[PDB]
Design a protein around this nucleic acid. Structure first.
Length: 116
DNA sequence: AGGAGGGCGAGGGCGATGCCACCTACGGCAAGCTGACCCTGAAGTTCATCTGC
């Protein structure tokens, strides 16, 4: 579990009370925040088939999440938990891989700091 | 000629410099396609070739 734990701990994101979002958010429903409108068109080679490999193995989430999650952020004009959480996972693992050098890893909570 | 040419002290006092609401409506953020070709196998035999006879 140390790779799925790290997947669901890099993916941890804030939830209020009675948040309709699961504590650990399912990958298909998580990747469904990257998809056009429903999770089947998320690219079965750099995405659903590679996020899972980047999740099952604690590898670095592909840039195609920033790219896709950002695409949906400004395309759905909102950041669903699942795009915030998935971006938190990407950026946390980009930091941890030294792929995002200066930045420091995100936390669950709002960082009333972070200067970024 | 030798004059004296102002001396004085005031030059704001008082309050007000905003009230009211509005700062959006609406909808769309995609469509469509592709996401790969090709091979590379075990296991065994054949078959062409070589060495030795």
């Amino acid at each position: 579990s140390e790779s799925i734990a790290a997947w669901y701990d890099d993916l941890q994101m804030v939830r209020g009370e009675n948040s309709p979002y699961p504590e650990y958010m399912p990958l298909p429903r998580l990747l469904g925040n990257l998809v056009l409108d429903g999770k089947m068109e998320n690219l079965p080679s750099d995405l659903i088939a590679q996020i899972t490999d980047a999740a099952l193995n604690n590898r670095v989430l592909p840039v195609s999440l920033l790219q896709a999650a950002l695409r949906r952020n400004k395309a759905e004009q909102k950041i669903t938990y699942g795009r915030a959480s998935l971006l938190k996972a990407y950026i946390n693992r980009a930091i941890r891989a030294g792929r995002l050098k200066n930045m420091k890893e995100l936390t669950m909570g709002l960082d009333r700091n972070r200067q970024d």
